[PDB]
């Protein structure tokens, strides 16, 4: 309820440039580039995401609401918007993270990642998600690919709210989302569980070898992702709770922060990793 004095920067096309493509995703294409604020004598390296065309009817109405949220973010574990340009296309400008997404990071560094880092990442993601819940925003696409590494000890969530805006990731979705297209903070919790599984397996693909078309059927039969080799039952049990059919029986993000935080105080008790003494 304090005044929100975030800045919404509406950028002229001349105030930034795209220099090199970094990759593409469900929502658009990401480039490294420069932000060159008019009359300020500086140039700042940034990431720029050019959004794909919306399949949604009202998205042009909603783009600004989405910008407001991204601009407004004030949590260490959620990424923020630097500026937005709306012309022929919508382009989002934000800080450039040299260390990239968490999914690639765990795959690339698997031999070197220990229990403290893994648990801390769980806490941090939970913290960011809790913040988004406080703001009444449902992410709809939480996944390891949508977490960026600021430093190996500091990760931040991206891309919240774009799925709705733009109008699927079946393997990360709660059953109610798949069957009924219902999305809630509790559906986010299910995705959080899948995301944790991705981390704990050093970036394995969930349900690898099962076609997306079969996922709703297997879930209904009680199948769930398996216990990762490094995980004690204490960690895995939390992940399984995230995947309860009854959304209200799943943990709250605030509870998740607490549970992971406790385990992060003695990480070797809760994850068993070679060379992690």
Give the residues lining the site for ligand 80U (CB under 6 A): 22-23, 25, 30, 47-49, 70, 79-81, 92, 94, 96-97, 100-101, 103-104, 145, 148, 158-159
Rounded to a whole number of angstroms, the minimum distance from the CB of residue 170 to Cl ion is 28
Residue 151's Cβ-count burial label (10 Å; 0-12, 13-18, 19+) is exposed
Closer residue to Cl ion in complex, CB, 76/226: 76
CA distance 145 to 186: 20
Closer residue to Cl ion in complex, CB, 47/244: 47
Closer residue to ligand 80U in complex, CB, 66/259: 66
Note whether 20 and 32 are within 8 A (CB): yes
Rounded to a whole number of angstroms, the minimum distance from the CB of residue 95 to ligand 80U is 6
Residue 258 sits at φ, ψ, to 5 deg, of -65, -45
DSSP-based three-state secondary structure for 171: helix
- The listed partner (ligand 80U, Cl ion, none) that binds 92, CB under 5 to 8 Å by sort, is ligand 80U
Nearest to Cl ion by Cβ — which residue?
Answer: 79
Per CB under 5 A, residues contacting Cl ion are 76, 79-80, 95
Rounded to a whole number of angstroms, the minimum distance from the CB of residue 45 to Cl ion is 13
Rounded to a whole number of angstroms, the minimum distance from the CB of residue 245 to Cl ion is 35
* Catalytically annotated residue among 74, 104, 111, 141: 141
Backbone conformation region of residue 95, classed left if phi is above 0, alpha if psi is from -120 to 50, else beta: beta
CA distance 155 to 143: 13
Annotation says 74 is catalytic: no
Closer residue to ligand 80U in complex, CB, 80/252: 80
DSSP-based three-state secondary structure for 68: helix
Rounded to a whole number of angstroms, the minimum distance from the CB of residue 46 to ligand 80U is 8
Angle of the 185-200 helix axis to the 233-242 helix axis, nearest 10: 150
Query: What is the 3-class SS of 87-104, one letter each residue?
Result: CCCEEEEEECCCCCEHHH
- The listed partner (ligand 80U, Cl ion, none) that binds 81, CB under 5 to 8 Å by sort, is ligand 80U
Closer residue to Cl ion in complex, CB, 80/164: 80
**Of residues 165, 137, 167, 181, the one with CA closest to residue 61:** 165
CA distance 51 to 206: 27
Note whether 117 and 273 are within 8 A (CB): no
Closer residue to ligand 80U in complex, CB, 72/232: 72
- The listed partner (Cl ion, ligand 80U, none) that binds 76, CB under 5 to 8 Å by sort, is Cl ion
Rounded to a whole number of angstroms, the minimum distance from the CB of residue 231 to Cl ion is 28
Note whether 119 and 168 are within 8 A (CB): no
Catalytic residues, by residue number, are 141
């Amino acid at each position: 309820e304090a005044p929100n004095q975030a800045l919404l920067r509406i950028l002229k096309e001349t105030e930034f440039k795209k220099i090199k493509v970094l990759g593409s995703g469900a929502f658009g294409t990401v480039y490294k580039g420069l932000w060159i604020p008019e009359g300020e004598k500086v140039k700042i390296p940034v990431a720029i995401k050019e959004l794909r065309e919306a399949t949604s009817p009202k998205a042009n109405k909603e783009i600004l609401d989405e910008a407001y949220v991204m601009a407004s973010v004030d949590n260490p574990h959620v990424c923020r918007l630097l500026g937005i340009c709306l012309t022929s296309t919508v382009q989002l400008i934000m800080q450039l993270m040299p260390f990239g997404c968490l999914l690639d990071y765990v795959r690339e560094h698997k031999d070197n990642i220990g229990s403290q880092y893994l648990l801390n990442w769980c806490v941090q993601i939970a913290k960011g998600m809790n913040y988004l819940e406080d703001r009444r925003l449902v992410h709809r696409d939480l996944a390891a690919r949508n977490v960026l590494v600021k430093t190996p000890q500091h990760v931040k969530i991206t891309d919240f709210g774009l799925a709705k805006l733009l109008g699927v990731p079946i393997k990360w979705m709660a059953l109610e989302s798949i069957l009924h297209r219902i999305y809630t903070h509790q559906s986010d919790v299910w995705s959080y569980g899948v995301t944790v599984w991705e981390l704990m397996t050093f970036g394995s693909k969930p349900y690898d070898g099962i076609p997306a078309s079969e996922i709703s059927s297997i879930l209904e039969k009680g199948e769930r992702l398996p216990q990762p080799p490094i995980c004690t039952i204490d960690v895995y049990m939390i992940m399984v709770k995230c995947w309860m059919i009854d959304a209200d029986s799943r943990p709250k993000f605030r509870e998740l922060i607490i549970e992971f935080s406790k385990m992060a105080r003695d990480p070797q008790r809760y994850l068993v990793i070679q060379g992690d003494e």
